[PDB]
């Protein structure tokens, strides 16, 4: 779709689309940029992630509204429409996963990029798991778990405990444990250990890095308050 547009123009248009709150456009521009085949910089990875999180976030919110109506209802219209939204959501998750598999992850050699993409892989399998029903749910859940675990192993070896990507990975893997894997105790243990190890490393940070790390630590604390 975007094969005739310059990489730099796609990036520029993705930034404009974010300003205009046109997240479907932003995702399409960033997909086009990935398909140019070059690795993404830190800023460009963030644009890719923001675009898709907004697109799939709207789909997930709609799916939850429709699933709630459908549960309450138990004609075919509510199920049919929930199914349509679900298929669209699955299609976007499959598109992101396909970008990660062709070929963002395999070309990511630095820890910052590899952890970032594996966290994405875990998140998009987690979104597939939210709508999956049965034994399909089992294999999708294991794919999410495996991606998060590999990201966790790299992050603990290669990044300080205050690194924002390390922190956000741990936050999202804790939500996976609580909401998907029915392991609330693992969720709480991970959030607590992550928070405590970050706290102990705050003294090493500049003012600006402190603000970045403590923002995500507050998210860990918010979950712990809800879960305990």
């Amino acid at each position: 779709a975007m094969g005739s547009m310059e990489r730099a123009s796609l990036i520029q248009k993705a930034k404009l689309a974010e300003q205009a709150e046109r997240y479907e456009d932003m995702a399409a521009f960033m997909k086009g940029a990935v398909e140019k085949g070059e690795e993404l910089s830190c800023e460009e990875r963030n644009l890719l992630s923001v675009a898709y999180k907004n697109v799939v976030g709207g789909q997930r919110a709609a799916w939850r509204v429709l699933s709630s109506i459908e549960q309450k209802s138990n004609g075919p219209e509510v199920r049919e429409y929930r199914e349509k939204v679900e298929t669209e959501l699955q299609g976007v998750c499959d598109t992101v996963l396909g970008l990660l598999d062709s070929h963002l992850i395999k070309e990511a050699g630095d820890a910052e990029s590899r952890v970032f993409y594996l966290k994405m892989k875990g998140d998009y399998y987690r979104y597939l798991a939210e709508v999956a029903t049965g034994d399909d749910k089992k294999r999708i859940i294991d794919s999410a778990r495996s991606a998060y675990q590999e990201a966790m192993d790299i992050s603990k070896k290669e990044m300080p405990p205050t690194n924002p990507i390390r922190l956000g990975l741990a936050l999202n893997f804790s939500v996976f444990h609580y909401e998907i894997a029915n392991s609330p105790e693992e969720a709480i243990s991970l959030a607590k250990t992550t928070f405590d190890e970050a706290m102990a490393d705050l003294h090493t940070l500049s003012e600006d890095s402190y603000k970045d790390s403590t923002l995500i630590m507050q998210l860990l604390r918010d979950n712990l308050t809800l879960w305990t």
């Binding site: 992630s49 999180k53 998140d123 999202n172 939500v175 909401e179 998210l219 918010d222 979950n223 879960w227």
Partner: peptide, 9 residues
């Protein structure tokens, strides 16, 4: 239970 919002950047 909240994941990273991740909707702005």
């Amino acid at each position: 239970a909240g994941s990273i919002p991740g909707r702005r950047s």
